[PDB]
Amino acid sequence: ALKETALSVGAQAGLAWRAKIIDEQLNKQARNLDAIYDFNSLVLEHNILPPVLLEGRNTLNLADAQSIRISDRTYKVAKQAHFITTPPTWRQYLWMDYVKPEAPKEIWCIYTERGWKNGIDQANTILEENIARIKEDFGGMILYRKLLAMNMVSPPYVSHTDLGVTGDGSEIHIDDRVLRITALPELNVNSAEWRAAVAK
Template sequence: MLPTDEDRPLVQSDAEPVDIEVLLGYEVEEDPDDDTALPFDIREDALKEAAISFGARGGLAKRTWEIRKNLETRARYLDKVYDFEQLLVAAPSGFKIEPPIVTEAMNAMIVDFSGQEAAVSDRIYNIIKNARIVSAPRNWRQYLEREWGEVIPPPAILLPRDDDERVIWEEHVRKGWKVGYEQADEIFNDDLSRLTLDFEGMVRYKLLLAQGMVSPPYALQVDRGVTGGGEEMKVGDRAVQITGVPEFVTGADQWKPANQ
C-alpha cells in the first residue's frame, strides 16, 4: 500500500516526478469501522474527479521535468541563439539599456466598421515595449525554465477501495495524465513563442535603427555628489535616467540601407 497522507507531497518540487504507474497504484484498505463512506453515486463522481486531478498534476509535473532536462542538454546552443546581452545599449555608470520590442505585420489590411473605407499597408511596425534601464540582460531561462511543483495525493477517502473502483481510478488517472502532459507542452510552446517574440523584436529594433527608421534611446547621468544623512550617506551618488525613448522616424528621406 502506498502512503495516503494528503499533507505529504508525492514528490518534492526539486526531485524527479514519479511515473504514471505510481499514481495508478494508489489505494486504501477498506476499514470496517469507517463511517465516512459516501453514497455510491456521489463517491463515484468524487473518485473520478480526484483521479483526473491527480493524474493531470502528475502528468504536468512529469512532462515539465522532462522539458527542463531536455533544455539542460541544449543550454549552450540556446545561450548562443538567444544572446540578449549583444542587443543591450551602453548607458552611463555601467548600466545597460534594453532596446524596445518591435513587432512587424506584413500586408496588413484594415476595414472600417461601416465597410465604406479600407486601408492596406505593406508593413506595420509597433513598439509594444519601449527601452528601459537594466543591470543585466535577459536570459532564455527566464522564459523556458519552469518548476514542476509538488504532486500531492488526494485524501484517503477519495482513493479506490475495491476492484471496481480500481478500474474507475486507473481510467481517469490516465485521462488526467494525458491532459496534464499535453498542457506542459502547450505551456512550453507559449513560453517559447514569447521568448522568440521578445528576442526577434529587439533584433528588429536594431535593424530599424541601423536604417534610420527609429530613433535611439537617450540617457542622462546626473552627478549628485554626496547625499543622504542621518544613518545613511551616499558618496559619489549618480542618477541615470532615460530622457528620450525610441520613436519611429516617418520621414522616409532620412532612411538609409541597413549596410551603411
C-alpha cells in the first residue's frame, strides 16, 4: 500500500509536469494556433458567434429486436448563435491548468515512475479531450458556413431598432440603437431550397 501512496505521490507531480511541458509547447505554437483557430474571421456581420452544427452520416439505431431506424445524415446544432463581444481564442479551450505542487524506497522509486507515467498520459488524455473540444467547435462553425452556403440553415436576423437621444435630464445616451437577434439560426426542413455544390 506504500507503493500505492508512492504512485499517487508520482501521479499529481507527473500531471503538473506534463501540464507545464505542454503549456510551453502550446506557447511555442501560439501564432500558428491563432492562424488555425481563426474564430475572429468566422463571426457573423453583427458580431454573432455562429452555431456549432455537428454532422453524423450513416446513422443506425437498433431500438429492439424488431425495429431499426436509419438515417443517412443527421445535423444537430449545439451552442446556438449569439452576440459575441470578443471572439474566442484557442486558450479558453486548450490551456492546461498549471499549479506546481509542494506536497512530497525502491518500490517507491519504481511505483513513483509508474505513477509519473500515469500522470503524463492522464494529462495527455486531458489535452486530447481539449483539442477534441476545439475541433468540435471550430468544425461546427465551418460546417455552419458550409450549410449556409448550401442553404440548409437560416442566417440570423438581427433588428436594429433605433432610438435617438434617450433619457431624462440627468442621463442622456445620444445615438441609442438596440439590436436584437429575432430569428435564431435553424436548419430548414424545406428540402427543395438546398444548394448542391459541384466542383472542378
